[PDB]
Symmetry: C5
Subunit: 33 residues, 5 copies
């Protein structure tokens, strides 16, 4: 069960990484303005 949960945590962390990348992309758009 701990392995299962640690893998679930890894998925959540990956989701956060994806969101952070999206923020960066938005910041880039703001810089272009």
């Amino acid at each position: 069960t701990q392995e299962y949960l640690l893998k679930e945590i890894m998925k959540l962390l990956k989701e956060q990484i994806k969101l952070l990348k999206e923020q960066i992309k938005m910041l880039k758009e703001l810089e272009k303005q």
Copy 2:
């Protein structure tokens, strides 16, 4: 208890993800401007 706590950690990560999404929404509002 360790499984229980890992599940509590997952809940917190989910909150953070929700908050990251809200940041993105706000950045999009800034970009409109």
Copy 3:
């Protein structure tokens, strides 16, 4: 020890959440401008 450290981790994640909420509030201030 593991229970103790997982609870410490939960404390750090709650601090992060707090900070993310503060970031959202600052983005709303920028939006007002």
Copy 4:
């Protein structure tokens, strides 16, 4: 080793906290402009 690795994870979380505080300071600088 489990204790050691959870402590390493805490160090990384603290580094994230430090960075989030830095972002907040920056947003405050943007708010002044």
Copy 5:
């Protein structure tokens, strides 16, 4: 297996930190504007 997953989690956290640093770099660029 658990040690391996904790290490994989550490790699994700490091990646988040790298992204957070990129965000700060972008904010500094915005501050120059």
